[PDB]
Amino acid sequence: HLCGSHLVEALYLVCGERGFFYTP
Amino acid sequence: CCTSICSLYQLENYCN
């Protein structure tokens, strides 16, 4: 992979059960 | 966070 899949996985780890939004 | 090194702490600014 490129950058975004790894970034979105890191967001999922950091933001736990409070979720996140993501627009590239 | 892909050319420059980020920290999981710096990512908190994207949550809810």
Epitope: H1 | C2, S4, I5, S7, L8
Partner: antibody, heavy 121, light 108 residues
Framework: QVQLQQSGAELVRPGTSVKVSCKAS????????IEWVNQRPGQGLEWIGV????????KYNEKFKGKATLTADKSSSTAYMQLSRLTSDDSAVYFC??????????????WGQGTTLTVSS | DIVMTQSQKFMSTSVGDRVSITCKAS??????VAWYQQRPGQSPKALIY???NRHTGVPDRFTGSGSGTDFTLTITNVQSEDLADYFC?????????FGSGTKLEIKR
């Protein structure tokens, strides 16, 4: 297999500069962050800095800013660490280690074998 | 800078007993903590990632737990090849910092 082979030991005089090599093999080299860590005789471990080898981005321990310079050669799949203004307090074993891609969600899952640096007049 | 405190610099045990090595963060580090093993004359080797996950190939007697500040590496049925140094580390924010280590020794 993940594998990091470091350059040989270094025995130099204070004030000089040194350049340590760390050759990666067994994975996609370009996007895995490479950390650098030192170990002084009998002590624990201190983090120096990290490099994104594909992008060339870096982040330094504030104590090592301007002492350590981290680089990457994507051609050879080699990471480099240069240490200037060497004093005897810098005598230590220096490790490179691999972490996850682009950003550190997993830190130092494979470690090189270490490079002994001795600084003496 | 975050300090990772391993309150016990030495820990004695007998082969087959249970040991529990603590590590307290100075501030909240979520689950971005790692555990390493270092045998004498060797490089460190990774054991636990993201607080509680075993790295591939590491025996199941090793177990990492914790969230927030109080982190723990529990070894059940300690074996002789487990006699070594154990370091925690936080990678929640830079610089990454290690605990100052716990040396696991045989009792007699």
């Amino acid at each position: 297999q993940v594998q990091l082979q470091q350059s040989g030991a270094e025995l130099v005089r204070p004030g000089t500069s040194v350049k340590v090599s760390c050759k990666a093999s067994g994975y996609a080299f370009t996007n895995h962050l490479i950390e650098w860590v030192n170990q002084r005789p009998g002590q624990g471990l201190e983090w120096i800095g990290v490099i994104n080898p594909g992008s060339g981005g870096t982040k330094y321990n504030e104590k090592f800013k301007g002492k350590a310079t981290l680089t990457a050669d994507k051609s050879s799949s080699t990471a480099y660490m240069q240490l200037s203004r060497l004093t005897s307090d810098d005598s230590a074993v220096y490790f490179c280690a691999r972490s996850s891609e682009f950003i550190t969600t997993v830190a130092a899952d494979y470690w090189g074998q270490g490079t002994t640096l001795t600084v003496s007049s | 800078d975050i300090v990772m405190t391993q309150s016990q610099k030495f820990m004695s045990t007998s082969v087959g007993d249970r040991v529990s090595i603590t590590c307290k963060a100075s501030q909240n580090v979520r689950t971005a903590v790692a555990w390493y093993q270092q045998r004498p004359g060797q490089s460190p080797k990774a054991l636990i990632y993201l607080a509680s996950n075993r790295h591939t190939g590491v025996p199941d007697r090793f177990t990492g737990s914790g969230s927030g500040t109080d982190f723990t590496l529990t070894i059940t049925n300690v074996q002789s090849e487990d006699l070594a140094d154990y370091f925690c580390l936080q990678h929640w924010n830079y610089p990454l910092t290690f605990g100052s280590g716990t040396k696991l020794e045989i009792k007699r």
